[PDB]
Design an enzyme around this catalytic site. Structure first.
Site, PDB file in Angstrom:
ATOM      1  N   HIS A 257      -7.430   7.809  -5.736  1.00 33.90           N
ATOM      2  CA  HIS A 257      -6.610   6.896  -4.943  1.00 33.90           C
ATOM      3  C   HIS A 257      -7.267   5.597  -4.868  1.00 33.90           C
ATOM      4  O   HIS A 257      -6.508   4.478  -4.823  1.00 33.90           O
ATOM      5  CB  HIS A 257      -6.624   7.479  -3.428  1.00 33.90           C
ATOM      6  CG  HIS A 257      -6.097   6.361  -2.351  1.00 33.90           C
ATOM      7  ND1 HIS A 257      -5.233   6.015  -2.134  1.00 33.90           N
ATOM      8  CD2 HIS A 257      -7.125   5.834  -1.365  1.00 33.90           C
ATOM      9  CE1 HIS A 257      -5.297   4.918  -1.023  1.00 33.90           C
ATOM     10  NE2 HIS A 257      -6.363   4.929  -0.816  1.00 33.90           N
ATOM     11  N   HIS A 262      -6.762   0.948  -5.158  1.00 34.82           N
ATOM     12  CA  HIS A 262      -7.669  -0.043  -4.644  1.00 34.82           C
ATOM     13  C   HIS A 262      -8.122  -1.143  -5.612  1.00 34.82           C
ATOM     14  O   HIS A 262      -8.136  -2.105  -5.645  1.00 34.82           O
ATOM     15  CB  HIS A 262      -8.609   0.548  -3.553  1.00 34.82           C
ATOM     16  CG  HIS A 262      -7.861   1.027  -2.351  1.00 34.82           C
ATOM     17  ND1 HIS A 262      -7.531   0.380  -1.258  1.00 34.82           N
ATOM     18  CD2 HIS A 262      -7.431   2.405  -2.004  1.00 34.82           C
ATOM     19  CE1 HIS A 262      -6.928   0.970  -0.440  1.00 34.82           C
ATOM     20  NE2 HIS A 262      -7.044   2.292  -0.699  1.00 34.82           N
ATOM     21  N   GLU A 302      -2.246  -0.664   2.068  1.00 34.32           N
ATOM     22  CA  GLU A 302      -2.086   0.857   1.407  1.00 34.32           C
ATOM     23  C   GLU A 302      -0.636   0.954   1.123  1.00 34.32           C
ATOM     24  O   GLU A 302      -0.385   1.426  -0.074  1.00 34.32           O
ATOM     25  CB  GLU A 302      -2.450   1.753   2.596  1.00 34.32           C
ATOM     26  CG  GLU A 302      -4.079   1.891   3.020  1.00 34.32           C
ATOM     27  CD  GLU A 302      -4.624   2.597   2.318  1.00 34.32           C
ATOM     28  OE1 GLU A 302      -5.965   2.634   2.362  1.00 34.32           O
ATOM     29  OE2 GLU A 302      -4.316   3.258   1.101  1.00 34.32           O
ATOM     30  N   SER A 321      -1.090   4.776  -6.305  1.00 35.51           N
ATOM     31  CA  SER A 321      -1.631   5.995  -6.668  1.00 35.51           C
ATOM     32  C   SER A 321      -0.789   7.046  -6.251  1.00 35.51           C
ATOM     33  O   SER A 321      -1.410   8.315  -6.596  1.00 35.51           O
ATOM     34  CB  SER A 321      -3.176   6.125  -5.751  1.00 35.51           C
ATOM     35  OG  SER A 321      -2.832   6.049  -4.331  1.00 35.51           O
TER      36      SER A 321
HETATM   37 FE   LIG Z   1      -7.371   3.652   0.868  1.00 35.51          FE
END
Ligand SMILES: [Fe+3]
Ligand SMILES: [Cl-]
Ligand SMILES: [Cl-]
Ligand SMILES: [Cl-]
Ligand SMILES: [Cl-]
Ligand SMILES: [Fe+3]
Ligand SMILES: [Fe+3]
Ligand SMILES: [Fe+3]
Lengths: 420, 419, 423, 414
Positions: A257, A262, A302, A321
């Site tokens: 993730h 990120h 996010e 992701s």
């Molecule tokens: Fe996160």
């Protein structure tokens, strides 16, 4: 509901912030008050103030309440002080880290591996392997290189399954900034279908790109802690991976993730500034506005969408992701609204299923200015700015004197860099 | 006489260029270097700041394997239509003087130094060996490493005391306000005491927490370009040895006394850190003619500069704050004082042995800083430079489009609060 | 010295400045306070405050004719909550700031504050010249800001004097005068009457300056107080004499004439950088004490009248006293006089002479550099407010909250560099 | 679809160019015109100490002696050609100085549907006002006129019926200025103020000045006058038969709708940027500016705290729309140039929608950002000292503009 806002849990850390003038003997007058109340020179720093040059800046990080409730009384009446507390009693500001080194304090304050419904629960190896990654985070301190880990063959398989399935979607679903960095991570980092890159190599890459650095963490910190770390362009990072039984599902963040969602965005300078403003807005903010910041973070970092010309693309880490939602958010099924923080701050959301709606940002520089405007509505008795030279936070009550000094610098670079 | 030291097997050869990702740029370029036996380890490709559609390239090569490189630059300029600047450091024709692109690159020429019978200390195995001991620390020092601490002998602490005690009595009245403002801090957090020599590591950490300045061990004297270049990164090359105890009041070379009592306290003030930084930034890629001019300005400002403090004048130069005699001579009516003007100071002749016949008075550090900025424009360079403290790299600005983007960050930076 | 102390009239001008909020209904409450006294509305202005949608700015222009009706009004405005007031007078000094004109029209008030009345004047035993001077005096005394400058037909004997000064000086400008001078002079030869055998009219010149830098000319009979003269520069107004020296000695004049002002002063006022510089000096005089006016008069002396400037590797002259003097223009560029760098803290107190050539001269790096030095010196002048000129309304803005206006000037100029540079 | 955009009709031909003083340019140019031809001005450039700015005021008459000069200026040794008409590769003409507003101030009765058509007095009374405008030149005082008793009644009906709505429907800025206009300009139910007294009042507030006009000018001409903070104003009044209706702008629309806002500096700056944005803009972008002007200056609403109020002149002078726009009937959108610039509208009936601006300073910066979108080979800024426009085409003009800004950062800090 299961929102993403995690309340902060706590000897509660008590820190003071104050500056004083050098008209009368000031250093001697203050240091003697601390030595007489059993406080050595190790829990007090005295540095010159940048805003007057005739003032000293004092930082105290104190376990000793009876020797601390007395200094505040003698210090305030006889001569401004800001009291920072981790338990957030009244007439106090919520504590926040003043220097990157202070991130070590509450870096191990995660909640609870131990969830019965976790995918890898009936596995003695996975449950134990998680303790190995947790020990790396608990024992890590700032400045240290991130300990490297040899990933097992069964774990690289999981990474490969997630890597290949998402790489095919980035060229068309990920924003331009993503596909701009990703080729670099494939060449200078171990971003390959059959290899998991080490967080140390990634951190060194981000540092050379935007100054961002990674920090191992065992689990999920309080929202206050996580956002607070962004003010220093520090991103708390998990080093473990999902259980290989279900590579396409995870109730918690893993290296997949964070490395695929990120990391690539933190490599873009415009995005580093935006996410930093969110952290800056959380320093000393009440719990009521931390949840508001956590909601903004949710719908921007996010699960945030951005406008790119006549089309829309995704830039949130939760989207980049996820193989399923990355296609669902770009379709005509979900509801899209323009980004307005006054509406996003209170909007309720879910974490289990895909998001019913998504917020579209005009740009990162546009989203950045929205955070600055929202940061002003947050009740705080001071303003904050990060100094990368000294890697400290500057408490600013007369903040206006410093912003102007930055303009006088930027402007002299446009007339000097005059080739024609 | 002058303080200008000209720059001198493996001459550093570096290139600078940015490119757009229109069709495929990274792959097309990386293969151009791989075909000429250039490992990727000697090439970095990072995103360009202020430009979301450009990549910035960094190369760390030597004079070796140049003939397989002088052909690459042509393919990058003509076959691609991009601007390239070749850094060679060895007066290659049509080349820019080499300068460090990253703070880490300061490790390259940190040992490019050039034993004197007339030296206060003579050729005696005791002292000369103690000097070689400090030289080994500098030659082996790297940016990431902590400065090795040293246990100073009592004979060396005694010399320090003689210089320390005799000078401390003059600072309250002869040194500028900024000096006496920091000195009390150095006495508590760095151990600036008559009977103790502080370690550069403890001091370096102190400047980092004040203005981001850091110290770097050096065995001797670097080239003016090399030394000044390090100031762009707010890095100050520092000597760790001490003068011979035979003449505590004289030194033909800089020593830890000159560097801790003359230079360090000013580097703790941010306004001075910015000023000194502009000098270093102005030297990156400057011709030898303008490096000497910058060395002269540094001489009359940082080493032997005076400043106005109200109706009186005080001293802030390192050469004065570390000399007991000149610190008193410069404040008398004997020397000649002029207003600070670089066009006159850059060419002014000076001496290094005897006291200065004249001194230049600066209105302030912020005023003197902008004078260097104005002078930075007269230096012929095909680009401008700015330091990025986040990544600790220098950003070259050659394309006009990079300035239009820089204007956006300014127009937005107009926060009209007005209460 | 050139400093002439300020003198007030029997009807010394007394004006007030104050702003108030519209919360308690101020227009009615304030306007009625004046109506209760013998104060006519025509001598009161109420204008909106900029950037403060809820404030009015009030201007009153009276004198000591009704003093007992004035010392009571000021108390009700200052002591009561809601209003700060600044009292401007010509000579009280108790709790008042030295009076200065707030609007360009008010320059008409003290435009006639003159001290050819000297027995030693060159043209003294001459009924024509002595009489011709009174003719020019009536033009100045009767001139008002709105009126066009009356043109005058100069006698042939006067054109000859002008020609003698013009020809002898034109040969020195190309080599002794600064770049800005020789840049403007060719234009004055074409669009004005700058010729060896013709005296141009002040109206034609004034219209030319207005189109260059907004500067305008104003007839004057003699020498005003330094405050009055300098004060007019804040409005980019230059008080100008219309007479000419006596033809007996074309190379000497104890007083300013059209030759000194047309050949020495106006060409520089056509350059924006110099117009801004001279304007900051005028702005610095508004409300300054007499002690700092003399200091300001010294700076003006060594910059505008007898100032030199750096031009590349060489230095040239830009002062009016040099550009109109045949002897000094050659003496100042030689190695006989002493040259020092321009520093106002040193120049403000430097003593000087007016009869013989100057023993020393101050060299300025540039006009923009000299401008900023005046701003720095302007801060040392004790004043309870700052001043800024509004060319749109042609008024002076008293500024205690001056910081709010500078931001709008930067935010505009910067947004103009992104419009053209959008490439 | 009735629109407010008025196309420009012819023709003034003007040139703009700068040259250096190192070579003999002034002499070379002055002889270049006399050798091919007297109406030419040469002034120093306020951005390069070694450059001159040249102004020429010629008509289309004697064109063959001009098409040769353009080649010698461009090919030998930058020039911008302004043509009142669309010549190929030329910029639309615009006034460079306030005096040049007199040229096309007369580039505009007998209409069957006009209220006062069956009346010889009113029809003739209108020609009286037109002669004042046609004969008016810049600098002159606006001739005062003695309004008839029949005309004061019409003014009174509109004044009293609208004054009762301003305190609650008009924006804060309006009710802030109106009390001043009642005392220093004579804004009373039974008196019509003279444009001269009003113009003098505006000049002392924000520098705005009034200029008589006979009718409706082209959108470029009208908007162009705003760049100089000049507002073309009508001096006649509607026919007394229907005091609540007027197909054209009259002194009521201009004194009660437009004038009070021009007294606020923030609004004066905003409206000025609209005029500044029109200088040299193609016809396609003039209509876009006319539409923006419609939804901002004529029919624009602004946010005032938690409530909404009106500041457009069309509302403040109309009794019906002033109540209709706040009645929640029309649909309100945020002010966004991409949406408002192209939105269609009508002039006969009330407006179906209204655009809400956050503030005057907020709307101003939106125009500046939009000012870049207009294709122009230069930028423009107004110089109130000399009252002329500064064209910025060459890169050298910007390096100097950067110095004046970096220097303008006076850090007093107390
Ligand atoms: Fe996160
Ligand atoms: Cl930054
Ligand atoms: Cl800084
Ligand atoms: Cl100006
Ligand atoms: Cl303005
Ligand atoms: Fe040194
Ligand atoms: Fe004079
Ligand atoms: Fe209208």
């Amino acid at each position: 509901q299961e929102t993403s806002y995690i309340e902060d849990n706590s000897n509660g850390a008590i820190s003071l912030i104050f500056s004083l003038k050098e008209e009368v003997g000031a250093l001697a007058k203050v240091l003697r008050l601390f030595e007489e109340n059993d406080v050595n020179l190790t829990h007090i720093e005295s540095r010159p103030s940048r805003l007057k040059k005739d003032e000293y800046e004092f930082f105290t990080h104190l376990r000793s309440l009876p020797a601390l409730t007395n200094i505040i009384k003698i210090l305030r009446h006889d001569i401004t002080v800001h009291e920072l507390s981790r338990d957030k009693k009244k007439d106090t500001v919520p504590w926040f880290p003043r220097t990157i080194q202070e991130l070590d304090r509450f870096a191990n304050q995660i909640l609870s591996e131990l969830d019965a419904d976790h995918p890898g629960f009936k596995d003695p190896v996975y449950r134990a392997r998680r303790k190995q990654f947790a020990d790396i985070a608990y024992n890590y301190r700032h400045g240290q290189p991130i300990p490297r880990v040899e990933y097992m063959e069964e774990e690289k398989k999981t990474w490969g399954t997630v890597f290949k399935t998402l790489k095919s979607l980035y060229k068309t679903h990920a924003c331009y900034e993503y596909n701009h960095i990703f080729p670099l991570l494939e060449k200078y980092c171990g971003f390959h279908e059959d290899n998991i890159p080490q967080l140390e190599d990634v951190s060194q890459f981000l540092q050379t790109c935007t100054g961002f650095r990674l920090r191992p963490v065992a689990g999920l910190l309080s929202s206050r802690d996580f956002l607070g770390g962004l003010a220093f362009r520090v991103f708390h990072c998990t080093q473990y991976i999902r259980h290989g039984s279900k590579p396409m599902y995870t109730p918690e963040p893993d290296i997949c993730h964070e490395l695929l969602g990120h990391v690539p965005l933190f490599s873009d300078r415009s995005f580093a500034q935006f996410s930093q403003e969110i952290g800056l807005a959380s320093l000393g903010a009440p719990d009521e506005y931390i949840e508001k910041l956590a909601t903004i973070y949710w719908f921007t970092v996010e699960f945030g969408l951005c406008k790119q010309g006549d089309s829309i693309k995704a830039y949130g880490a939760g989207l980049l992701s996820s193989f399923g939602e990355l296609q669902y958010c770009l379709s005509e099924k979900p509801k899209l609204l323009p980004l307005e923080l006054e509406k996003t701050a209170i909007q309720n959301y879910t974490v289990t299923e895909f998001q019913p709606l998504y917020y579209v940002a005009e740009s990162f520089n546009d989203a950045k200015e929205k955070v600055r405007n929202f940061a002003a509505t947050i009740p705080r008795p001071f303003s904050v700015r990060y100094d990368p030279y000294t890697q400290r936070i500057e408490v600013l009550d007369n903040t206006q004197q410093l912003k102007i000094l930055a303009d006088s610098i930027n402007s002299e670079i446009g007339i000097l860099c005059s080739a024609l």
